[PDB]
Amino acid sequence: MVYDKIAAQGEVVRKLKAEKAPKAKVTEAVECLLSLKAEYKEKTGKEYVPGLEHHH
């Protein structure tokens, strides 16, 4: 029950927006979250759910 790249940079932005960062980067990660998760879909979450994944 783990997700590499998707979590990898997923948290990167999560930390950025937490410590106050640019939206451009936060959304950038949001994408890697939706994109990477789609690549992931191994056998745990299927299109893993990181945190943002294009959160509104």
Topology:
Layout: H1 4-18, H2 23-40
Helix pairs in contact: 1-2
Describe this structure in words.
The protein is an all-alpha fold and 56 residues long. The protein has a single domain (1-56), classed as Helix Hairpins. It is built from two helices and no strands. It is elongated. The modification Phosphotyrosine is found at residue 48. Residues 3-51 form the WHEP-TRS domain. In the N-terminal section; belongs to the class-I aminoacyl-tRNA synthetase family. Glutamate--tRNA ligase type 2 subfamily. This is Bifunctional glutamate/proline--tRNA ligase. The modification N6-acetyllysine is found at residue 37.
How many strands, what sense, and barrel or not for the largest sheet? none
Q: What's the helical proportion of residues?
A: 55-70%
CATH architecture group name: Orthogonal Bundle
Number of domains as seen in the coordinates:
1
Q: What count of helical segments does DSSP give?
A: 2
Which superfamily, in CATH terms, is the homologous superfamily? S15/NS1, RNA-binding
The global form is elongated
Pairing-aware structural class of the strands and helices? mainly alpha
- Kindly report how far apart the N and C termini lie: 25 Å
Pattern of helices and strands: HH
Strand content: under 5%
Radius of gyration (Å): 11 Å
CATH topology: Helix Hairpins
PDB class: ligase
Keywords: TRNA synthetase (ligase), protein transcription, ligase
Assembly: monomeric
Entry title: eprs second repeated element, NMR, minimized average structure
